[PDB]
Ligand binder design. Structure first.
Ligand SMILES: [K+]
Ligand SMILES: [K+]
Ligand SMILES: [K+]
Ligand SMILES: [K+]
Ligand SMILES: [K+]
Ligand SMILES: [K+]
Ligand SMILES: [K+]
Ligand SMILES: [K+]
Ligand SMILES: [K+]
Ligand SMILES: [K+]
Ligand SMILES: [K+]
Ligand SMILES: [K+]
Ligand SMILES: [K+]
Ligand SMILES: [K+]
Ligand SMILES: [K+]
Ligand SMILES: [K+]
Ligand SMILES: [K+]
Ligand SMILES: [K+]
Ligand SMILES: [K+]
Ligand SMILES: [K+]
Ligand SMILES: [K+]
Ligand SMILES: [Mg+2]
Ligand SMILES: [Mg+2]
Ligand SMILES: [Mg+2]
Ligand SMILES: [Mg+2]
Ligand SMILES: [Mg+2]
Ligand SMILES: [Mg+2]
Ligand SMILES: [Mg+2]
Ligand SMILES: [Mg+2]
Ligand SMILES: [Mg+2]
Ligand SMILES: [Mg+2]
Ligand SMILES: [Mg+2]
Ligand SMILES: [Mg+2]
Ligand SMILES: [Mg+2]
Ligand SMILES: [Mg+2]
Ligand SMILES: [Mg+2]
Ligand SMILES: [Mg+2]
Ligand SMILES: [Mg+2]
Ligand SMILES: [Mg+2]
Ligand SMILES: [Mg+2]
Ligand SMILES: [Mg+2]
Ligand SMILES: [Mg+2]
Ligand SMILES: [Mg+2]
Ligand SMILES: [Mg+2]
Ligand SMILES: [Mg+2]
Ligand SMILES: [Mg+2]
Ligand SMILES: [Mg+2]
Ligand SMILES: [Mg+2]
Ligand SMILES: [Mg+2]
Ligand SMILES: [Mg+2]
Ligand SMILES: [Mg+2]
Ligand SMILES: [Mg+2]
Ligand SMILES: [Mg+2]
Ligand SMILES: [Mg+2]
Ligand SMILES: [Mg+2]
Ligand SMILES: [Mg+2]
Ligand SMILES: [Mg+2]
Ligand SMILES: [Mg+2]
Ligand SMILES: [Mg+2]
Ligand SMILES: [Mg+2]
Ligand SMILES: [Mg+2]
Ligand SMILES: [Mg+2]
Ligand SMILES: [Mg+2]
Ligand SMILES: [Mg+2]
Ligand SMILES: [Mg+2]
Ligand SMILES: [Mg+2]
Ligand SMILES: [Mg+2]
Ligand SMILES: [Mg+2]
Ligand SMILES: [Mg+2]
Ligand SMILES: [Mg+2]
Ligand SMILES: [Mg+2]
Ligand SMILES: [Mg+2]
Ligand SMILES: [Mg+2]
Ligand SMILES: [Mg+2]
Ligand SMILES: [Mg+2]
Ligand SMILES: [Mg+2]
Ligand SMILES: [Mg+2]
Ligand SMILES: [Mg+2]
Ligand SMILES: [Mg+2]
Ligand SMILES: [Mg+2]
Ligand SMILES: [Mg+2]
Ligand SMILES: [Mg+2]
Ligand SMILES: [Mg+2]
Ligand SMILES: [Mg+2]
Ligand SMILES: [Mg+2]
Ligand SMILES: [Mg+2]
Ligand SMILES: [Mg+2]
Ligand SMILES: [Mg+2]
Ligand SMILES: [Mg+2]
Ligand SMILES: [Mg+2]
Ligand SMILES: [Mg+2]
Ligand SMILES: [Mg+2]
Ligand SMILES: [Mg+2]
Ligand SMILES: [Mg+2]
Ligand SMILES: [Mg+2]
Ligand SMILES: [Mg+2]
Ligand SMILES: [Mg+2]
Lengths: 65, 49, 9, 85
RNA sequence: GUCCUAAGGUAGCGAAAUUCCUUGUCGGGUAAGUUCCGACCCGCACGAAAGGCGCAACGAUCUGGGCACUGUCUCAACGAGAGACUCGGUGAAAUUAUAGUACCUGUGAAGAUGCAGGUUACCCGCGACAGGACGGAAAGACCCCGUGGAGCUUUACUGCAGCCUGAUAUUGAAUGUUGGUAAUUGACCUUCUAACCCGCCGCCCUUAUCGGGCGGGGAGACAGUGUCAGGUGGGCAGUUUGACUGGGGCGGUCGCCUCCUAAAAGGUAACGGAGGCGCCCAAAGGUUCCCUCAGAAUGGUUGGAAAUCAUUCGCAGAGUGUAAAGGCACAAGGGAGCUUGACUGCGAGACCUACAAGUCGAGCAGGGACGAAAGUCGGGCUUAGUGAUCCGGUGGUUCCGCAUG
RNA sequence: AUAGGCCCAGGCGACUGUUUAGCAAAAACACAGGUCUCUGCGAAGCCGUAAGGCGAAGUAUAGGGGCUGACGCCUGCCCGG
RNA sequence: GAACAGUGGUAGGAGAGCGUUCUAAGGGCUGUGAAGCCAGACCGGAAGGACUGGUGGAGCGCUUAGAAGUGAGAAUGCCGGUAUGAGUAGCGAAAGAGGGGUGAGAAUCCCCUCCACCGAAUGCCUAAGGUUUCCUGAGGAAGGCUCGUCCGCUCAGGGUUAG
RNA sequence: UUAUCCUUGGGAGUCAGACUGCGAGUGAUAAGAUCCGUAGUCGAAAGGGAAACAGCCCAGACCGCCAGCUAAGGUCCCAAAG
RNA sequence: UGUGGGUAGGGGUGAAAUGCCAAUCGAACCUGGAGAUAGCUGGUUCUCUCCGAAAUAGCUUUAGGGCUAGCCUCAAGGUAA
RNA sequence: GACCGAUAGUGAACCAGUACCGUGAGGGAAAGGUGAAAAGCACCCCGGAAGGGGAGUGAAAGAGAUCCUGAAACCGUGUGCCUACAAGUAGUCAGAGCCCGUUAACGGGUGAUGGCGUGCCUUUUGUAGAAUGAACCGGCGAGUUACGAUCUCGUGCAAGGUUAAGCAGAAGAUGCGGAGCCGCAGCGAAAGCGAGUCUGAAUAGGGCGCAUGAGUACGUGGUCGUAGACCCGAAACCAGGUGA
RNA sequence: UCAUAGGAUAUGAGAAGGCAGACCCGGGGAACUGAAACAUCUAAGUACCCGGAGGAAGAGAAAGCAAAUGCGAUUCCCUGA
């Protein structure tokens, strides 16, 4: 049978032009009183998946174009 | 699986939605039109053919 | 044949 | 085999180490922004072209060469000087 | 007397099938009695139908003591038979890395036939004995561990049966009565009979204590049953019931900050040594301007050791919201005026780092605060004061909106 | 050849019975007796989805369940949970 | 080809190879003796490969490539065979003795004599169950814990009669 | 002077360590103890020495040789050499 | 005590020991789901060569497991860092 | 039929769902080969027979029914060398003596005596281990395959590459089949814009892209995923039956 | 009372049962297992039991698909993915 996409990951990552994985930041749901504006400003912007994590998860997103 | 450490995908938030009515166009750059003959009526049907 | 065995509790 | 009861300690806590101290060497070339020294208080003062952050971090305001140098009798500063150009 | 309780254990029994201390103490029995019997009562922790205290008879019951009796013993001897032993016949088994398989002291995964150094020993059997081969037998039942089971429990969690209760259908007819609505609909009580029910009687199908039919009688719109609902519910079911740990349990701990251990970068363990935190402040924030603290001596109304006043001395012996450390007197400490930068968009570049996060940041733009200006200001002397994702709420929104709006 | 040893005193269970086939026969279970409690008969209780049954061809002097355990003397106080 | 340097190794990474069965294509071998098996003092850096002789009596190599049920010393592995213990433990409650006979062979079978054991049974009958074990004749490979001429065993025949 | 180093990609294994020396804690300035730091060796390392003896001293086994020089440790005999 | 019958496994039966239900009982036996699952133990078969670890950090219902990092290897680059 | 060849292949090549086990449901084996042909050994001899020795038959009887081959363990007979003062993981290196004579080699067998030397495996910080496993010998006995993913290598074509089902055709190659798939463009949650785009008021800055061009189809190999997924092994759980 | 229930007789190549260890349509319907525990979820409408078949079954001639110049019963394969 075909490999199944990991649907949780597919809802959270996106493949960039060069084959990096774009992601959002954690700590962006609630408790904004406890985080500084600088933190909040930075967590708002997207990020990339780390090398160590990418090798762990790349096959889970193999089908995604 | 990370042996019970909360997995990376679960630590990060879901983002966005998918549009039902998303349109993807077949893009053609000018360089590809350069391959046709001069005074040609370039159309989708010709490009496809 | 012992009740408990060798090095019993 | 009998085993005597034992007490407990009320200690056993410590915070994470904060990796303070010098982050660039005297005579090393730095880019503007480079953290030179992490500290509580001013163990070292900001010299020429150096800034003091909100947590007393000393950082280079220009690109140049790091110089740690005596600041009067008791104190020290760190400065960054532009390269010969 | 006082405190407390729903009430404070009565009678009887008591070192007990119960007594830790304990061989309690005293008496009896014995030459000598941790046992036994009788007393005593500081009952660790008896006690009245999970009965209390007695009790004739009964017991392959347990306990202590006697008479008799004895190879139980002092302490062993002899004899009989069955094996064992020899010959003839027949002929297994567990075990087994290969073995030409000494001893001592030592060594070594810390207890050696096999290693070292010595000591001893001609080759092969047969009867015997079990010290060793950590002998054989059984992948230790103890103990721990496994996010392994099973049985059992309950005021563990979630369910289910059962049971109770309501609504509604089956379910009809009258009568009053009492709530919205002046004439219409709900609730309630009573009555009726025709549904439904009868593990009542007679008759018939019929040789039938089944069933059905027919006729009486009883009961009756109740019950029973269906659907839905709440309660109860270890009766039953599926499961959960943390880790660290000088074994486990029990105790303690679990995240964050500061110091020491930490070996003069950074980092660095232990159930090592010490403390803090889960905030606070509308100023205790920003800026401009001005300033200097502890303590002591001496003088002085109330007024003292110490209140406020004055002088002198005074690197700080103070302060810095709060633990500690590092800092801080061109103050980061104290005072006053005006303020809200405790800004929005960001951010070259760095630190830290497995990741996730965490930290610092010049500078640019917008629009401001204070300042004459220079300039400073994206909270607080610095470093704790916090929690991913999913899910849900609220506000905003040139986004999407399953034929189209 | 075959054919009770006996006695003094105590614990426990009144007694004859019963039980862990194959490591426990007992002081355990049972028991007659006591008491509490449920049950008005299509009884309660129990088995079964139900029909059908046991209860019982019984009917409160009966039936089911809990606790106690011959007999004797007795069985106190607390209804706050 | 030279020089220079290097070449201990568990987990493990990388490389180069050996051998096995099958297939395809070349090419071959073999009753003047295939494979297998046995032996040997041969050859290759290893896995391994030949040669000679014997046994065997009909199939089999080689080259290149392909494909895999492709390599065993351990799993208290599975199945089979055979050891060790060992001529050892045992031979399952009991009274026999002698004479005669039979026979290839006799403690053990038959006959005789005396002796001994059971006798509310170890006797007689009969259930259940077994199913021919019953009777006669013949037999002795196995079964019989020894032996065996005997037997509940082998082979032949036969045998069970109801108002 | 030496030949490493970095990046990207493929493939792992490891997450029980041990002792020794030195610097600390815990302990009794005990433990072949325990827990860190640091170097070594063992692990995964045969050879020589320390009688024997993973972890100490000397020293790293591609093979062959009936050659030679040395290390630690040794040179009366076992036992090579005073 | 014989004969003939009855009760059946989320169940029977129990003068109660968790006893007994065909040498099986804290839940019989057989077949199937089924090659259950096993972070555990055992085992895993030819050769030589090149290189050659780790027994640590972080997080973990985690501690004898795992994941990322560290350390090994192969390739391709950069190249001399 | 690049399937098995008697421990394989069906449990069953054979009188097998038999024998055997179980009250029952149910479980469930072992066991193929004389020779071309029976020509299956007349006759003689020892023996009660079994079994032999001849004689015959046959290509072969050492093919004689326990009958193709006939390994090993294990059991024997003979004897060249050694062995009754020796302390043995059994060898190894040194070595006389004696006995032999080969795939002819600085040969073969034996081995007085000397030196050195605690099996193999597993598991471990560390095992000669007084830890684990194996009595021995033999056979059998463990990373596979399918479909996906990804990387390396190879090949074809290349800003392109490629067909699936299906139809025809040896169960084939191959031809046809362009539906579809991947790539050539990205950025953004999205509308959308596009070598840019998103954020933002911004012609700022910054993120991801471009400039800094290779993919795709197939094959081998490495690894991953889903499947029992390297093999063997629970206690248990559930379903339907069989038993008083 | 009519009558009905019931009874009797006659006629029926009427039914019954088996079987593929397969395929098919229904009724009923697990658990281990995975989730690194576990309850929602998974395993799976699987195994299994039961009923009904037929040579195939089921489905099927639009109260459909869609959003075009539309398509025109069902089933099955490829693809979408
Ligand atoms: K006594
Ligand atoms: K008594
Ligand atoms: K050992
Ligand atoms: K012994
Ligand atoms: K200890
Ligand atoms: K102010
Ligand atoms: K009992
Ligand atoms: K041959
Ligand atoms: K074996
Ligand atoms: K008698
Ligand atoms: K006879
Ligand atoms: K050390
Ligand atoms: K029971
Ligand atoms: K078979
Ligand atoms: K020797
Ligand atoms: K052991
Ligand atoms: K940009
Ligand atoms: K290519
Ligand atoms: K592949
Ligand atoms: K696999
Ligand atoms: K489940
Ligand atoms: Mg939000
Ligand atoms: Mg002791
Ligand atoms: Mg701050
Ligand atoms: Mg006394
Ligand atoms: Mg006495
Ligand atoms: Mg009591
Ligand atoms: Mg009471
Ligand atoms: Mg050793
Ligand atoms: Mg020692
Ligand atoms: Mg010793
Ligand atoms: Mg030994
Ligand atoms: Mg033993
Ligand atoms: Mg042993
Ligand atoms: Mg064990
Ligand atoms: Mg036990
Ligand atoms: Mg329960
Ligand atoms: Mg479960
Ligand atoms: Mg624990
Ligand atoms: Mg402890
Ligand atoms: Mg606790
Ligand atoms: Mg240091
Ligand atoms: Mg330091
Ligand atoms: Mg969630
Ligand atoms: Mg719409
Ligand atoms: Mg009694
Ligand atoms: Mg009695
Ligand atoms: Mg018993
Ligand atoms: Mg009995
Ligand atoms: Mg007994
Ligand atoms: Mg009833
Ligand atoms: Mg009745
Ligand atoms: Mg009682
Ligand atoms: Mg009593
Ligand atoms: Mg009372
Ligand atoms: Mg070397
Ligand atoms: Mg062959
Ligand atoms: Mg194989
Ligand atoms: Mg074997
Ligand atoms: Mg003998
Ligand atoms: Mg004998
Ligand atoms: Mg013996
Ligand atoms: Mg003997
Ligand atoms: Mg004997
Ligand atoms: Mg006898
Ligand atoms: Mg007879
Ligand atoms: Mg015999
Ligand atoms: Mg360590
Ligand atoms: Mg130690
Ligand atoms: Mg190791
Ligand atoms: Mg090394
Ligand atoms: Mg060594
Ligand atoms: Mg030595
Ligand atoms: Mg070793
Ligand atoms: Mg000498
Ligand atoms: Mg039994
Ligand atoms: Mg399954
Ligand atoms: Mg190396
Ligand atoms: Mg584990
Ligand atoms: Mg890694
Ligand atoms: Mg054969
Ligand atoms: Mg077979
Ligand atoms: Mg039978
Ligand atoms: Mg022959
Ligand atoms: Mg032939
Ligand atoms: Mg043969
Ligand atoms: Mg001598
Ligand atoms: Mg001699
Ligand atoms: Mg010795
Ligand atoms: Mg150990
Ligand atoms: Mg073991
Ligand atoms: Mg063994
Ligand atoms: Mg269950
Ligand atoms: Mg039955
Ligand atoms: Mg019966
Ligand atoms: Mg699970
Ligand atoms: Mg049809």
């Amino acid at each position: 049978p075909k490999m199944k996409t990991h649907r949780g990951s597919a809802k959270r990552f996106k493949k960039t032009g060069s084959g990096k994985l774009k992601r959002s930041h954690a700590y962006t749901s609630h408790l904004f009183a406890n985080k500084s504006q600088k933190q909040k400003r930075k967590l708002r912007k997207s990020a990339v998946v780390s090398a160590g994590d990418f090798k762990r998860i790349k096959q889970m997103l193999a089908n995604i174009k | 699986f990370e042996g019970g450490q909360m997995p990376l995908f679960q630590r990060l938030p879901k983002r966005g939605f998918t549009n039902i009515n998303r349109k993807e166009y077949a893009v053609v750059n000018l360089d590809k039109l350069n391959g046709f003959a001069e005074g040609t009526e370039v159309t989708p049907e010709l490009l496809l053919e | 044949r012992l009740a408990l065995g060798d090095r019993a509790p | 085999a009998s085993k005597k009861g034992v007490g407990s300690t009320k200690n056993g806590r410590d915070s994470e180490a904060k990796r303070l101290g010098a982050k660039r060497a005297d005579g090393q070339f730095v880019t503007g922004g480079s953290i030179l020294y992490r500290q509580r208080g001013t163990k070292i003062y900001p010299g020429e072209n150096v800034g003091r952050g909100g947590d007393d971090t000393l950082f280079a305001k220009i690109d140049g060469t790091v110089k740690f140098e005596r600041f009067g009798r008791d104190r020290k500063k760190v400065s960054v000087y532009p390269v010969a150009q």
